[PDB]
Design a protein around this ligand. Sequence first.
Ligand SMILES: Nc1ncnc2c1ncn2[C@@H]1O[C@H](COP(=O)(O)OP(=O)(O)O)[C@@H](O)[C@H]1O
Ligand SMILES: Nc1ncnc2c1ncn2[C@@H]1O[C@H](COP(=O)(O)OP(=O)(O)O)[C@@H](O)[C@H]1O
Ligand SMILES: [Mg+2]
Ligand SMILES: [Mg+2]
Lengths: 85, 506, 473, 236, 51, 57, 89
Amino acid sequence: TNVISITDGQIFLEAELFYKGIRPAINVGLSVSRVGSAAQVKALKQVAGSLKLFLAQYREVAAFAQFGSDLDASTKQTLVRGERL
Amino acid sequence: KAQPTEVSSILEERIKGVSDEANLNETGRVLAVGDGIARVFGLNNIQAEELVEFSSGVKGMALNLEPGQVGIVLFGSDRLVKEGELVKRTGNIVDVPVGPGLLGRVVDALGNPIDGKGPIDAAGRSRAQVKAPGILPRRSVHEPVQTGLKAVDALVPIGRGQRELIIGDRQTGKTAVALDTILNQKRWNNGSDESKKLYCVYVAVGQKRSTVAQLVQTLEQHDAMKYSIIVAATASEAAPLQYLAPFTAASIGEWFRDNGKHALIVYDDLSKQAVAYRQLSLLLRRPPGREAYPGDVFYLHSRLLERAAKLSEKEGSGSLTALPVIETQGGDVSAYIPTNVISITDGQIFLEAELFYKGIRPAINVGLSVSRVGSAAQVKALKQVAGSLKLFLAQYREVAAFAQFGSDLDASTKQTLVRGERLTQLLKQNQYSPLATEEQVPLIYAGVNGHLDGIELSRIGEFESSFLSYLKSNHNELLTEIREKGELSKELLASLKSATESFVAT
Amino acid sequence: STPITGKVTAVIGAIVDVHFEQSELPAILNALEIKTPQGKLVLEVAQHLGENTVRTIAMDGTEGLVRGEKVLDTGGPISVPVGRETLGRIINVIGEPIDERGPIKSKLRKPIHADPPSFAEQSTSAEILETGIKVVDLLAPYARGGKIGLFGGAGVGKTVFIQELINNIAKAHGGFSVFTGVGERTREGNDLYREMKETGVINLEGESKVALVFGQMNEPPGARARVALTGLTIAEYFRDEEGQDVLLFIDNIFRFTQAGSEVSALLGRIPSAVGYQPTLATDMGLLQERITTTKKGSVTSVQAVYVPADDLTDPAPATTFAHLDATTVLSRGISELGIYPAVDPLDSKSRLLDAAVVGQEHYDVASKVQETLQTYKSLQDIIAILGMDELSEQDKLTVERARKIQRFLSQPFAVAEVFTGIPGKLVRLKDTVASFKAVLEGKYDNIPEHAFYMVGGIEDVVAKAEKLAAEAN
Amino acid sequence: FRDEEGQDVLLFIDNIFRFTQAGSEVSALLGRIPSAVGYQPTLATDMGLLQERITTTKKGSVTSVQAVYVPADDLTDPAPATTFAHLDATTVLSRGISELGIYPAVDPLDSKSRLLDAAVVGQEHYDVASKVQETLQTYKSLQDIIAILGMDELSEQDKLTVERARKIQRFLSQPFAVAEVFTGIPGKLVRLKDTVASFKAVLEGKYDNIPEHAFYMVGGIEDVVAKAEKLAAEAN
Amino acid sequence: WVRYEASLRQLEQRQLAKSVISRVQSELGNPKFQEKVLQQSISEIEQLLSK
Amino acid sequence: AKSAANKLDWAKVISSLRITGSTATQLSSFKKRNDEARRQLLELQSQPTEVDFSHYR
Amino acid sequence: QDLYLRELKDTKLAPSTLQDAEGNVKPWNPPQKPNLPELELQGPEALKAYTEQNVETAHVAKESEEGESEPIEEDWLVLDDAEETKESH
Ligand SMILES: Nc1ncnc2c1ncn2[C@@H]1O[C@H](COP(=O)(O)OP(=O)(O)O)[C@@H](O)[C@H]1O
Ligand SMILES: Nc1ncnc2c1ncn2[C@@H]1O[C@H](COP(=O)(O)OP(=O)(O)O)[C@@H](O)[C@H]1O
Ligand SMILES: [Mg+2]
Ligand SMILES: [Mg+2]
């Protein structure tokens, strides 16, 4: 807690993500940057501006995989996008 | 302005007389003053917890008298005091001005006026530390304290001389219910019967000055400051002042108690007093006990609270009612200070944020809120009259035990659930709205008959106001009958049932 | 005159012991100077140890202090320049300017240690401070003359919350504002100073209606402790001598208590609960009582409490709750689900939530919002275990509505556009109370809960719902 | 009284825990290193020195009843936990059962005594008490499963056991004569044989049809029948 | 009007306190360090006469 | 003195289950109720309408 | 007592021109004769609503209106409206 209170952002790394198969782990939601966003490469910012939105959408959708059904087309598209992401 | 002139002349003449006859030789010299406390060598004849006067003017009090040096807790800042400063022992144990002139005034821990309304007129001086009355001088609590809120009066009644703890989380209505209890007394304090008058003493220990100003103005608006007493121990004020202010207010209330009058002292906070005393011990070199609290926080709380009692007729039949508070941390009732104070007070009043946001405006947790005198210390019209009003608490416990989580067994279970829901709906009461017993009784009775057919739960809020208005119109005879007689006759019960049926028909 | 020379006898971390001769003892909290090679070092007399020895707290680093070094007594406590001259200047604990814009030409230097104004208070806690944040404008209204807590742990978003507070208020406030930055990030202070400079809030060649205090957590404990006091000196001088409504701003009031515990660990004091200083309540009250409305002027405080280890029961956050008219508790759990700001709707609370001040309509809307959210939290356990199906129709509708309100609580901030990616919204109090009243009646039950995510008013909710239903679907 | 007078004595000590509390209180200032939970180091020693002098000798008998206050409702606190071993008959009053409306508040499980033996109270008494204890234990093991999932999912035998244990738990509550200030019902003196007969009848399932409310705040099984009849009469 | 008069009394007390600094400065420059010493010495003598 | 009047008024109301569908009779009832409530509120809150020149001056 | 008499007449003469004698005020330069008696006399009126509340403006009660002397139209309309609702009791 105190170290987060000092540093300018955190890069959380899930243990289960490491065990699940995601080798770099890194919880895309918990990890966040304060001052590197303005310092990000401009082309990288252009190509990754909506990446956060897609990953957040997957983070919400993965809580819907229990009732395997049609799940609406939008959620299926978000899943089939974020899994490749 | 001749008054400042003659008071200055009199004070300076007294100073001259003291200088002419002082012969202070064994007076102490400060060795090491810490953070609001000083260790002083000398004072070979100092009494324990005796007031002293430093050369800088800051008053002190002697907790630990070590061999050679004695620890003096300062009743103020340590700005002015320095090493080698003379200390003048007052020769008397710390005391507080007491009497009827304290009414309408706001005073600090030592009793000095802080409201800027002039000097304090005191009938006498009472020790801040006064032994509690013994087994015999007390009397069983029978005279109720009319709080004016439906839930607390019906489920956890407070009586004259009772000690009821308002235990709760942060900003859960503790000082709020304290305030409704405070304000409800204006009905009787504006009369002439001193046996029903109940003078009030608020202890603002650890509260901020803005909150105390809010308090005093709120009491001013609802014609309540005239009979209430504000003993403010600001957090910025020295920790010894916070430690001592509830004791001095207890002495002030004991003045009323010993003179045949009834006093209600609300020990609001008192957890701030607990931590202030923890600070006192932890800089007085006293080793602590549990969670760094000193050994005698239990003894402190018990000794302070036990001064509140209902004296016997031989002692003037006076009473001193205590309303202490505990600020729990995250609803932790099972903590050292909370369970300690609960073991002192004659019952507790639990408030949590859970019921506060769930809708219960008094936030009365009927489960852990219990009063040690149910039948006694309650209005006769409200205690049992029809029987159900007596096992009201047991019915609430049943409703909790078979709430919506429990399976709705049958029509009897549905009726019980509806009764419980309507009853907890009724108990909600708006702030600064003390509802008298002559008006409480019809509502509690309506919660047993005609409660089930209420049109939506949310509408009971306006249904209560309409029922009050109905009882006011050509039914004030019933209201004054239940107010004056106290008990309810069979014909009175029949009339109340008829009125309830007539209203529920409309 | 005659200098008062003291000799250093002990240097215990940030605490230095100084020995004087007979009848030259500085009082408690007096300022003591030593001519170090890097400049001057200021010592505040914390205790008298006897034998003409004083225990002092350092305002700067104690490295290079040799026992027996000459100590000069300033004759009084630390004096910080005050007045409109300090406006637009950056000052550390000592009082010297650290904005590299020359010395401050202040006519007066009031001491940082002052008594509270006692019973010169007013019960003027009836003016709602419209901040533009819909959740606090609805659940925990802020007082113009009161104190705002703004709690929160690591992350959560307390710094962006306070920064949004300056951005919405100090730009169009009738008076001056003071920022203390008590034990925070120096880069945060630089960024926020630059942000005020861009907005014209601090104009170097202009009015510059805001005074800045710093001495961030890179400084020793004594600094972090007394920077709140010097900022309070600035605020009090503006409040009393100037007769102006002052916007105080403390980025982390908890760091003062942390520094107090740090120095107490070296002050020879047996620790309090959770190893804090025993006087935590006393110093905390002395700190907070200098923040009062007073007969002349008024103060808005605005604090920001850091809860250690996300423990709301920690002694310092527990103590500061009393000295706060309104609080804004930011819970990390809400931050996980993404509703930002992460303020806990049913843990913020405000004394201003009364029908007399509010109006019995916004009060009822807030009460029903609390109703729905409390029911939602109570039913979370069985929602996780069993699910929504087990609940009856009323409970299911209540849970869905409460989810909608909790999503609606999220509001974009102009100082967080780089994070949200959506332009910030400033929702008026009437707008948000009308929107949440309309939501509570069920007029927007058909609208998906995602349409309430990162929106402003109910019109923005309708717009987002239409966009999601047509362009996205 | 016990030794010199040679008379039977009932030493009623109310909340004996205050002795250990005061010992730990003075220990801190007595230059004694505090023990666990901030108690005096000698707590067991002085407390046992007090407790042993309370005993039945060859010169007389002392039927002492001592109340014990558990801090924070924590039964593992050193003072009551060590006091347990000094006590023959134990009656534990937990807040949880009191919260359910059972005013006697005696938790039936840990309330244990050495006299609960077939050679002392009789084989039938031991059997009835043991059956009651297993019924309450089966209830308690099914707290969470009923609360979070539902009573419907339990088996028919499990449902019968749960409802019988609810009836028993209600039947534990008894009107105390000094408790009319709270109950409002006159106190009842349920005899030992009456209690055994009532509980063996209930355990046999003879009164499964009687509602749970009729067992609330009553005396013997005759009082249960009377309350059930009154409830049926008022319900119509 | 009542609390205005109360505030007027408070203000006149405050102005008397303000004039107290001039009162103190009056004796600060006054060569008072001789008569006061003699008076306090004779007061001490009278004090110890009883003792 | 007022008890008889509203007693007979609500007696007529108790008889009025059969003339249901009326528009302003109930409205006039709440009008009377509001007016008499304002009556008793103003009479209760009315402090002695004179300055106590003996003391309060 | 030299410690007494001199401080006594010092504390008497310093406010003597302030309060006893009409010598304005010597200890502080700003005048007090035209300030508290004169400028602050309207202080309660300045904080309050001047010439609006201190004068206690008395508005004569508006005459309570009634049916405005309508003995035909009102009665006939009421009877007709009651007749409309009487068929649907
Ligand atoms: N009828 C009521 N009872 C209790 N609290 C109320 C009521 N009406 C409003 N409140 C709100 O609840 C809060 C009560 O908290 P309070 O009693 O002040 O606790 P604390 O003094 O410990 O902060 C108040 O801030 C008030 O705004
Ligand atoms: N308006 C906002 N929009 C998006 N994120 C925010 C907003 N306000 C705060 N945050 C979040 O706050 C988190 C940390 O904020 P900050 O309060 O600076 O940390 P700390 O409280 O430890 O100082 C970041 O993860 C950031 O996403
Ligand atoms: Mg309170
Ligand atoms: Mg921060």
